[PDB]
Structures are given as structure tokens and as C-alpha cells.
């Protein structure tokens, strides 16, 4: 009774529905207790299990991101300079599935309701230029959109001279302060919305057209002096299912600017039920406290059986090598468990994966200790490569298998820059080299509590993914003309003023070294991208053993 047993105190379930115009967003209103726990008691570890129509069940784990970005840098030395950036970022509360939370009170359909939920697309845009000789004002928009301390291209913009986004204007999947009361889940990945290459037009109202928008902010510097450079920076949350763009700044679906689309890798599985396993684990800033379930009816236990009455649930993935063997979009299959407790991987294109499963039956007590680290910094990748990035100081030999409770506490909104291309100033790449700039989106001080709790096993020596970022980017050219020379940001060149499409996948792995340490590994896989700057998402990882 005193040994800090981890027990599931209460269980709640809901049936998903494709109602209210939700085409592929299987949604449901959360049970009142689940909503109260998710919002007003975020320290309590609640496990979320998705059950699919084929009978496979998966326990939500990790985080994932979806980036769609475009940028161009045309210039003519005698006439003008003009540049633009546009990035759409989606996030999910799962590594492979598209999971998020929203309010049923918001107007519109479910996709339009997502404009105020965690499933929205965070749209950032900058447009700049200057009419004059030898102008470099193509990069002024990038200098305004991103906060960078790096000494490079001439333009630097002060905080008062650009737009800063308050922390409450963005929607993290684990945000607990917005009072979400509904959940959605898809058997797909986050939408990588690839549309548009420019921010708001400074001669217009800056309105957002297309998708239902909310939280729209924009800054405009439009002096009456014709010699001054002009730039505009905009932000808006939009419905993830539609193309969102600023007024008079739409995307031409032409060769110079690359393709358009909404990209999401399907998994071949369709959700049908969601279960919440409320446990007695209470996160306390540094570790976890066993509170409740003291030694009853409907009191499930959790265990990691090392291979009938047990309900096995696939929790996390394990691979022997951090490299995915892919160059471009690397999709991890979903670790599920069939109706007969048989682990399997559903979908994806990464090989060598193993499905780790949990056992829920009606032990695995807390083991004293725990440890934490903050994944902070910038990693520069010049191709496909895996880099050791972190370490959490705890010994996993005492734990039953590698069972742990993991909490990713996001201190600030650096997660919005956790991606590569599109999450930093593309002018960082122009000064070729291993320069480690800190270019990031100008988000304000933190006021939103962002936590994700998961339980997962770390096999000895194997790599466990817990944070993926998928990005579809286009190094665009505004137009195809000899008069204006486009800037190659992350490609060798634009061989015909044709937009060069690129793909990448950043994955963070948690490896049980066995030398009383947990190492953190960041892996990158690129296609048609010469270099990238990954920003560590400032994630505080809290890990506690389970035995």
C-alpha cells in the first residue's frame, strides 16, 4: 500500500463521430470529468487510448508538428527588391495520429471550430521590399518576422518595430488554459498546409481570406517616403482544412512558386472510440507524486509484461537506429495492439520498428529518483544525420523493462520554431557555414500552461521517438523573368526560376543507454534541402521510473 502503486482510478470512454461537417476529423465531446481533469487539474497523469474500427488500440504518446513554408527573394539591382515568407504550422498531441482539442462553443463546423483549438494552422507571414538601387530589402521581412541575434545580412528590426504574438494567441496541443471540452482524432498526420509565399499586403486591410480565421494580428511599416523600405508581418490562426492567405496575397499555382496542397500521410486506420485512464500519478514540477488509489471497484492496474484478461495497448515505438532510411517525409507507423493482444505497426514508411505495449488489467509502482533536463539550443544539419542532443540522469535497470512516466513541459513557445525550414529566417542559410543562429518566431512571454503526459517503455539500447516535425517547403521564385533573380535559400539554385520543393523530418529519440542515463537524439532526413537549422523546442523532460 505504501510502495506507491500506480493504479488507474477511473476510466471514461466516448464514441467518436463525423458529425457537424467533420469530413475526416473523428471528434467527440469529452466527458465532463475528463474535461475537468484536462483543464483544471493538468498535473494528474491521464492516459488517452484510441480504439480503431479494426479493433486495434493505441495509447497517445509524444508530439508531432506539420510545417508548410514558402519563401522567395527576387531582386533587380537597378529597380527593386522584394521578398516574402509564409509558414503554416500545425501540431498534434500524438507522434503519428492527428489529435487535438477544441471548444464545441466556437461557431462553424468542426474544421472551422479547430481555428480556436489546438488543431489550427498557425500562419506566419512577412512581405518586404524597397524600390531602389542594389536593394536587399527582400530580407527585411525575414528580419522582422524572426527574432535573431546573428550578425549577417544588414537588416535587424527592434521589438517595437515589428509584430509580437502573445502566448495566448497560439494553441499548443497540451495547452490547459483555454478550457477545451472536445477532442478530435484522425488516422492521419498533421496537415502541412503549403499555400502562399507572402504576408499581408501593406496597401490593404491585412484581412485573412479562405479558411475561417481567428487571433489575427499584423504589423505594417508603410512610410510615406518612397525611399524607405516597406514591410508587413502577419499572424493568424485558421481552419487547418482550407487554404488561408492574406488579402490580395494569394498563391498562384504556377511553376515559379511551386505546388500547393494540404499534405497528411494516412495510416489506413479509422478511429472509433477514445478511452481516458485517470491515474493517481500527479506531476509536481520536478517529479511525480502518487496521490489517490490508496489500498477497489473498477480500479485497473498498469504493467509491462515481457511477453487473455489483459487489455494490451501499444504505447510507443522502438528502433535500433535513429536513422529512418528515408530522405524527405518520414512517416512512423502507429504502434497498435490488435484485439487479440498482438502488437503491430499500422501504416508509415519507416522500417525496423517494434511495437511496445502496456498491459491494463483489473504493480508497476513508482520508483524514487526521477530526473529532468531542458532540451534547449540550436542544431544545424547539413543533410541526413543523427546528433546526441540531451541527457536525463536516471538509471533504467531497476525499472520493470524501461517503463517510465514522461512529461513534456513546454516552458515557452519555442515549440513553434522546433521545425527546420520555415521556422527560422531563411537568410540564416545565406552565410554558408555551421553558424548556429537563434532565429525564432517573435512570440511573447509565456502565459499558457503546456503539458503532455505519457507512459512509455524504453528498451535497452533502442531509440524511442517522442517528437516529430514534418515539413514541406518550397524555395519559390516570385516570377519567371530574367529581370529578377530569385534567391536560393536552402537549395543550390533555381535552375529555371522554378520553385524547388523540399521535404524534411526531424525526430527526437529517447534512448535507454543503460549507463544510468537516458540520451536524447535528434535525427534529420531531408530531400532537396541543402541545410537546415533545427531549434530545440525548450522542452523540459521529466522522467520517473516505473517498477
Amino acid at each position: 500500500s505504501d510502495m506507491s502503486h500506480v493504479i488507474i482510478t477511473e476510466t471514461h470512454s466516448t464514441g467518436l463521430r463525423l458529425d457537424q461537417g467533420a469530413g475526416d476529423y473523428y471528434w467527440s465531446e469529452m466527458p465532463s470529468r475528463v474535461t475537468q481533469l484536462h483543464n483544471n487539474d493538468p498535473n494528474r497523469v491521464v492516459l488517452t487510448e484510441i480504439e480503431f474500427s479494426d479493433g486495434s488500440r493505441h495509447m497517445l504518446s509524444g508530439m508531432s508538428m506539420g510545417v508548410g513554408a514558402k519563401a522567395y527573394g527576387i531582386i533587380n539591382p537597378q529597380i527593386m527588391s522584394q521578398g516574402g515568407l509564409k509558414t503554416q504550422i500545425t501540431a498534434s498531441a500524438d507522434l503519428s495520429l492527428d489529435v487535438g482539442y477544441f471548444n464545441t462553443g466556437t461557431s462553424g463546423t468542426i474544421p472551422q471550430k479547430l481555428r480556436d483549438g489546438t488543431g489550427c494552422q498557425h500562419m506566419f507571414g512577412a512581405f518586404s521590399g524597397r524600390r531602389g538601387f542594389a536593394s536587399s530589402a527582400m530580407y527585411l521581412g525575414g528580419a522582422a518576422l524572426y527574432k535573431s541575434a546573428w550578425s549577417g545580412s544588414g537588416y535587424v528590426v527592434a521589438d517595437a518595430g515589428t509584430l509580437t504574438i502573445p502566448s495566448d494567441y497560439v494553441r499548443h496541443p497540451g495547452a490547459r488554459n483555454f478550457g477545451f471540452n472536445a477532442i478530435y482524432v484522425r488516422g492521419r498526420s498533421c496537415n502541412r498546409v503549403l499555400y502562399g509565399m507572402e504576408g499581408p499586403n501593406y496597401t490593404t486591410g491585412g484581412a485573412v481570406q479562405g479558411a475561417s480565421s481567428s487571433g489575427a494580428l499584423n504589423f505594417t511599416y508603410n512610410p510615406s517616403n518612397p525611399e524607405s523600405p516597406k514591410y508587413s508581418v502577419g499572424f493568424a490562426r485558421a481552419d487547418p482544412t482550407n487554404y488561408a492567405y492574406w488579402e490580395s496575397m494569394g498563391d498562384p499555382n504556377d511553376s515559379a512558386n511551386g505546388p500547393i496542397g494540404i499534405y497528411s500521410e494516412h495510416l489506413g486506420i479509422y478511429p472509433s472510440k477514445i478511452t481516458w485512464y485517470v491515474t493517481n500519478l500527479v506531476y509536481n514540477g520536478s517529479g511525480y507524486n502518487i496521490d489517490g488509489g490508496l489500498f477497489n471497484t473498477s480500479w485497473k492496474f498498469i504493467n509491462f509484461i515481457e511477453k487473455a484478461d489483459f487489455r494490451d495497448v501499444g504505447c510507443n515505438l522502438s528502433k535500433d537506429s535513429p536513422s529512418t532510411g528515408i530522405s524527405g517525409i518520414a512517416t512512423f507507423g502507429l504502434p497498435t495492439t490488435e484485439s487479440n493482444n498482438a502488437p503491430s505497426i499500422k501504416g508509415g514508411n519507416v522500417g525496423g520498428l517494434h511495437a511496445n505495449v502496456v498491459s491494463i488489467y483489473n504493480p508497476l509502482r513508482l520508483l524514487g529518483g526521477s530526473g529532468s533536463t531542458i532540451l534547449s539550443g540550436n542544431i544545424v544539419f547539413q543533410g541526413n544525420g543523427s546528433v546526441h542532443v540531451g541527457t536525463v540522469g536516471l538509471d533504467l535497470n531497476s525499472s520493470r523493462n524501461g517503463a517510465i512516466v514522461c512529461t513534456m513541459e513546454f516552458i515557452d513557445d519555442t515549440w513553434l520554431s522546433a521545425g527546420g525550414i520555415g521556422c527560422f529566417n531563411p537568410t540564416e542559410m545565406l552565410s554558408q557555414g555551421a553558424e548556429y543562429g537563434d532565429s525564432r518566431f517573435r512570440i511573447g512571454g509565456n502565459t499558457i500552461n503546456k503539458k503532455l503526459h505519457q507512459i512509455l517503455s524504453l528498451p535497452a539500447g533502442e531509440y524511442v521517438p517522442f517528437f516529430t516535425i514534418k515539413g514541406t517547403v518550397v524555395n519559390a521564385c516570385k516570377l519567371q523573368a530574367a529581370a529578377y533573380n530569385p534567391t536560393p535559400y536552402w537549395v543550390s539554385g533555381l535552375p529555371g526560376s522554378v520553385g524547388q520543393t523540399g521535404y524534411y523530418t526531424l525526430t527526437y529519440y529517447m534512448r535507454n543507454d543503460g549507463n544510468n542515463n537516458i540520451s536524447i537524439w535528434l535525427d534529420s532526413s531531408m530531400s532537396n534541402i541543402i541545410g537546415m537549422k533545427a531549434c530545440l523546442p525548450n522542452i523540459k523532460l521529466i522522467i520517473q521510473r516505473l517498477t
Binding site: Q78, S153, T204, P226, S228, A483, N485, S497
Partner: protein
């Protein structure tokens, strides 16, 4: 007795091939035209063709100030497209692209005629403002053996020669060899100028009807001098401490270089079959190369153009006013130009009307391969203007703040024109037209992208002259022009050509018994389809702009006595952006409202001072706006030039003379012009030149 430049200015300067492509007296030309002869240029000794036109109306010859790199002219408030030079040599365009513009030394020239207003009816695509036509020195009937020496201020040294003779004894074969080697220090410290030019010419004249002259001109300029920009803070207006930059300020790097090489060969052939049919053909092939490593200023750090530059940002807000932001350009160009112009002149009578029908075919082709690298913002370290220059690494081409410009420009123009000068008693109507097929092709070698546009344009000119027996010749003409655009819009297509139309009413006083040439003209010249800024939040250009220029030009040449010759001119210019997204209603930069110039020289023909010529002159430039926004204004100035010339004929050397030229006699420190707040040019300092010409 009278001097050589006397009759030259008032008699020899009355014939004009330019403006009609036929040898027509100026009073019979329906358009304003000014002629400067070799004798006038011998007297004044202009440093370039620009200074030769210092006493003609409607042209702004010194907007660039002390710089001598190009012979750029602003005629009637207008310049060529791309701020190029609309200069013609021997009736064929000296076509240039980008920085590859050719200049002809005035010592190699026999005449310089400037046509004012549209002349596209004869010369194809051209600026609305006008045209400068230079005539190369031709072999002389009589022998010529002239050597010239110059020793001026700023370490100026020029040695030149001009030899002409007849190979045979009758005169069918004759040649001419004109050369000069010029070395000087530029006004701006650390800049020098070197020029070597030679002009071999050869005339084959089997008889009086036929004439074939081979014209060549080879020029080498290891250093062309200063071509930089200076801020208006420090030149027009005081620096924050209350001082001004010295007139010899050089904002460039120590290793700033600027080279030019010119090689042109051609011929001028005319032949008269009979009194009815005459044929003329002008041909020239030119190969010009330009190289350059230039660091140039781009206004102070407090200029709006440098609003967010990192280097200016790190300065204290007080210090931002006296730090000069700078950029650089590294350029290497190779231009190939070929032009041939064939004319058939027909003379016939239709009853009581005398017809001079000119039918011509003109072909031009240009190619320019540019290999440039441009420094953008923060590509050059800031320069402190309070300091009492070092090297620059032109090869460290950082892609963060610089970029390539590798362009192959191709141009082609074919034109067929018909002109009719029908004369009835005293009325002479001039009706002409021309059809052009200008094609342009531009290839971006960095991205392998091509821009191409073919233009079909028709321009016509119509003028009437009434020839009073008093010499008074009232006239009026309407002239059209076109100039194909080089920019592209949002869709990547080259714009339609801009067009210039002009109504001009004038009076010419060219008496037949007196040495006086007085001409006046009032004009209304409009350039429609001008390119302007996008009003819809884009930085591309759009069509639809319009600039209108009205004004009055008065020019007077007279020989009041056999000893006194007076050349004067006055100009009133009203240039205004009639339609434009910005600058609407503004006056274009570097265009003064009033310009005046007066010259007078006195020659002693008797007494102890016999053979001495005293010359003096003064050019006034009114205030002009320093930028298209008309934010600030460049003040007026008056520059006085003196001249002392002594004919060495009495001392024993006939034809020889020694002269002493002082330009800017009162050493006025003035800003010549500014095209924007960051590009300003100092006027030339006082220059004293002693020159000796010996005729053997």
C-alpha cells in the same frame, strides 16, 4: 583679319546633316538643333563632348559634376531609358548597355550637333529629350601636321597629334591619324584618369561624286576616374557638426578601379549617280569592354534607405548622421555593336514644288554580356565622415549581403523611313515617317531564364518652315518618339514602349549677309507610358505614367565685330510628372527651371597685344530638386570660365598658338546635382590648363 572660330560658329555651324539626314541649313530644319564645330572646340578645349555643349540651350551638361566617365546628357528634362547616353557617332548610334557606354574624345571630333526633341522618325528608338550626333574628323584636302601639349592642374598631362595628308599626288587617296595620351588626377583624392585614343581614318575619293571614308577609333582607359555617390548630408546641407565634406572627398575604396576599352571600325560612303539620285551608307562595328571594382556611398546612416541596416543600427542615434553607408559593384562587360544605315536621296520637281525625298533602311544589333556582382545593404563597412580610405576585399562575395548579376542582353532594330522635304517658294514642309522592328532578348545566366519582346512602332514627324527673305524663319513641328522598355511587370513580360510626342513652335534668325544665328523655340514635350511604382502593395513597376516638359529655349551666336564673338543661350524648363503613382505633380530631379550661359572672346588684331585672344564666359544653373519626391532642393550656381589665347603666327609659327584655360575661375564650391538624397555630386574645382598647339 578674323579668327578661325569666328566664322565657324556663325557660318560653318549653319549646315546640319543631323535632324534631316541630308545636308540642310539649320533654318530649313523644322526642329531645334545646335552645332558646335571643331574650331569652337579648339578655342574652348572642352574636356569632353558635354563641355563642348556648354553654351547651347535645353541641355544640362554638368549634372554629374566632376565625374568624366560618361557623356550623359539631360536634354529638355529627359534622359535615355535606364539613364543611358543617347549619343550618336557619324549618324550611327553609339549603342551601350548597363555600364558599357562608349565615349569619344572631343579632340577626335569635327562637329557635335545636338538634336532637341524626338528624332525617332530618323534614328529609330531614342529618348524623347533629344539626341547628340558626333562627327569624326575626316582626312583633309590640305596637309595637316599638328601636335598638342597640355600641362594643367591636378597633374594633367596630355600629348596629342593630328596628322593628315594625301597619299597620292592628285588627292584620290588621303588619310588622317589623330591620337592623344591623357593622364590626370581626379578631383576626388586617390582617383586618377588615363586615356589613350587613336583614330585612323582613310578617304578614297575617285572623283567629286563618289566618296568612301574608312573611320576607326580605338580608345584605352586603364582608369576612368571617379564615379561615386555622396550624401546630401555633407554636400548640400551641413553635417551635424556644421561642416561640409571637402570637394575632393572620395568615399570609395583605395583599390577602386574602373576601366574601359573601345574598338570601333566602320565607313562612311556617299555617291551621286546624277543630279536626281544620291546614295549614302554609314556602317560601324564596335567592340567595347568595361571592367570595374567600385565601392560607392549610399547616403548617411540616418537616411531612410538605410533604416534597418545592422551597421547603422549599432551606432548611437547621434552618430547616425555622420556615418556614410556604402555598397560595392564588381563588373566585367563585353559589348558588340553593329549598325549600318543606307539612304537613297531623290531630288525631283512636282510642278512648282521642289521635292527632296529621302528613303532609308537602318539596321542595328547589339549584344552585351554582363558578369557583375552587386553588394547590397551592409556589404561595405561604414565610413566616418568626421574623420580627418583603406583597401576592400572585392572577392569575398558574401551571399548574405551581395549577389550575382550575369545577363546577356541582345538588341536588334530594323527601320525603314521615308522623309520628304517639299519646298514651295518660301514654304518648306517636312513630312517624314519611320517603321521600326525593335527586338530585345535578355538571358539571365545565373538562373537560365530568358526575357524577350518584339516591338513594331511607327513614328512620324511633320514640320513647316516659312523662309522670310529677312532671314527670319518661323517654324512649327510635331515629332513622335518611342523607346522600348527594359523592365518587366508582375507577369514577367516586358512592358510596351514608352512614347514621346512634342509640339514645338520656334523662330530662327539666320540672315544670309550677316554672321548672326539667333534661334528661339517653345515646346510641349510629353513622355507617355512612363514606368511608375505599383500602387497595389507590390514593388514592381507598372505602365501608364506620364511626364510633361514645356519650356522656352533661346540661343544667340553673333560676331559683333571682327574681334568680338558672342555665344549665349537661355533655357526655361517646366518638367512635371503629369501622371505617376508617387511623385505626382513633382518635378524630376536634376532639372533646373532656368539655365543661362554667355560667352564672349576678344581678339587683338593691332598694337603691341596683337594676336592675343581674351575669352570669358559664365554658365548659370538654376535651383533643381534633389530627388523625385522633391523633398530637398539643390541650390543655384554660376560658374565662370576664362581664357587667354596667343596666336604664335607673329612670333614665327603660323597656325600655332598657346592658350591658358581657367574653368571655375572663382573656385565656387557647389553641388552640381543630386538624383536622390544619397546620390549627390560635387561640382568641378578650379582647373587651370596651359595648352600649346603647333602646326607644322
Amino acid at each position: 583679319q578674323e579668327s578661325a572660330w569666328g566664322p565657324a560658329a556663325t557660318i560653318a555651324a549653319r549646315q546640319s546633316a543631323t535632324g534631316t539626314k541630308t545636308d540642310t541649313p539649320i533654318q530649313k530644319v523644322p526642329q531645334s538643333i545646335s552645332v558646335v564645330t571643331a574650331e569652337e572646340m579648339a578655342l574652348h578645349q572642352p574636356k569632353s563632348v558635354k563641355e563642348a555643349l556648354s553654351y547651347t540651350p535645353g541641355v544640362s551638361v554638368g549634372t554629374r559634376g566632376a565625374s568624366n566617365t560618361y557623356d550623359h546628357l539631360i536634354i529638355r528634362g529627359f534622359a535615355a531609358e535606364g539613364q543611358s547616353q543617347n549619343n550618336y557617332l557619324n549618324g550611327l548610334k553609339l549603342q551601350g548597355n548597363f555600364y558599357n557606354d562608349a565615349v569619344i574624345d572631343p579632340y577626335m571630333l569635327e562637329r557635335a550637333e545636338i538634336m532637341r526633341g524626338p528624332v525617332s522618325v530618323l534614328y529609330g528608338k531614342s529618348s524623347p529629350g533629344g539626341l547628340l550626333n558626333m562627327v569624326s574628323k575626316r582626312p583633309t584636302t590640305e596637309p595637316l601636321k599638328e601636335v598638342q601639349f597640355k600641362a594643367g592642374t591636378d597633374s594633367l598631362f596630355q600629348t596629342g597629334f593630328d596628322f593628315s595628308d594625301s597619299l597620292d599626288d592628285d588627292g584620290v587617296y588621303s588619310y588622317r591619324l589623330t591620337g592623344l595620351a591623357r593622364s590626370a588626377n581626379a578631383q576626388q583624392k586617390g582617383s586618377e584618369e588615363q586615356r589613350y585614343a587613336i583614330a585612323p581614318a582613310f578617304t578614297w575619293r575617285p572623283d567629286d561624286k563618289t566618296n568612301f571614308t574608312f573611320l576607326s577609333y580605338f580608345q584605352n582607359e586603364p582608369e576612368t576616374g571617379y564615379y561615386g555617390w555622396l550624401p546630401k548630408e555633407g554636400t548640400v546641407e551641413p553635417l551635424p557638426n556644421g561642416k561640409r565634406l571637402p570637394t575632393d572627398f572620395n568615399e570609395g575604396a583605395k583599390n577602386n578601379t574602373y576601366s574601359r576599352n573601345e574598338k570601333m571600325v566602320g565607313y562612311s560612303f556617299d555617291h551621286e549617280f546624277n543630279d536626281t539620285f544620291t546614295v549614302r551608307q554609314n556602317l560601324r562595328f564596335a567592340e567595347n569592354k568595361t571592367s570595374q571594382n567600385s565601392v560607392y556611398g549610399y547616403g548617411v546612416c540616418s537616411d531612410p534607405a538605410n533604416a534597418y541596416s545592422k551597421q547603422c543600427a549599432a551606432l548611437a542615434p547621434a552618430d547616425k548622421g555622420h556615418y556614410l553607408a556604402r555598397k560595392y559593384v564588381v563588373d566585367d562587360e563585353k559589348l558588340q555593336n553593329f549598325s549600318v544605315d543606307t539612304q537613297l536621296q531623290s531630288k525631283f520637281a512636282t510642278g512648282d514644288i521642289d521635292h527632296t525625298l529621302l528613303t532609308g533602311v537602318d539596321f542595328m544589333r547589339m549584344r552585351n554580356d554582363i558578369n557583375a556582382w552587386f553588394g547590397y545593404d551592409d556589404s561595405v563597412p561604414l565610413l566616418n565622415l568626421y574623420n580627418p580610405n583603406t583597401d576592400f576585399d572585392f572577392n569575398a562575395k558574401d551571399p548574405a549581403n551581395s549577389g550575382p548579376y550575369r545577363i546577356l542582353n541582345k538588341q536588334k532594330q530594323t527601320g525603314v523611313y521615308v522623309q520628304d522635304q517639299a519646298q514651295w517658294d518660301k514654304v518648306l514642309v517636312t513630312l517624314g515617317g519611320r517603321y521600326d522592328w525593335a527586338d530585345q532578348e535578355s538571358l539571365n545566366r545565373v538562373a537560365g531564364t530568358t526575357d524577350k519582346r518584339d516591338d513594331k512602332q511607327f513614328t512620324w514627324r511633320g514640320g513647316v518652315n516659312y523662309l522670310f527673305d529677312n532671314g527670319v524663319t518661323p517654324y512649327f513641328s510635331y515629332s513622335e518618339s518611342f523607346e522600348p522598355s527594359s523592365q518587366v511587370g508582375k507577369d514577367g513580360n516586358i512592358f510596351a514602349p514608352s512614347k514621346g510626342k512634342q509640339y514645338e513652335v520656334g523662330v530662327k534668325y539666320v540672315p544670309e549677309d550677316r554672321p548672326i544665328v539667333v534661334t528661339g523655340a517653345v515646346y510641349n514635350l510629353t513622355k507617355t507610358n512612363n514606368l511608375m511604382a505599383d500602387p497595389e502593395g507590390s514593388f514592381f513597376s507598372v505602365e501608364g505614367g506620364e511626364i510633361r516638359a514645356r519650356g522656352v529655349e533661346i540661343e544667340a551666336k553673333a560676331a559683333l565685330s571682327a574681334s568680338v564673338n558672342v555665344v549665349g543661350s537661355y533655357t526655361y524648363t517646366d518638367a512635371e510628372y503629369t501622371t505617376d503613382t508617387t511623385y505626382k505633380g513633382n518635378t524630376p530631379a536634376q532639372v533646373p527651371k532656368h539655365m543661362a550661359s554667355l560667352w564672349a572672346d576678344y581678339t587683338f588684331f593691332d598694337g603691341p597685344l596683337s594676336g592675343l585672344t581674351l575669352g570669358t564666359g559664365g554658365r548659370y544653373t538654376g535651383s533643381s530638386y534633389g530627388d523625385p519626391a522633391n523633398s530637398f532642393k539643390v541650390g543655384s550656381y554660376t560658374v565662370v570660365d576664362a581664357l587667354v589665347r596667343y596666336d604664335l603666327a607673329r612670333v614665327g609659327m603660323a597656325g600655332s598658338n598657346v592658350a591658358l584655360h581657367v574653368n571655375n575661375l572663382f573656385d565656387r564650391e557647389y553641388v552640381a546635382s543630386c538624383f536622390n538624397t544619397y546620390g549627390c555630386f560635387w561640382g568641378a574645382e578650379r582647373q587651370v590648363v596651359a595648352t600649346a598647339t603647333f602646326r607644322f
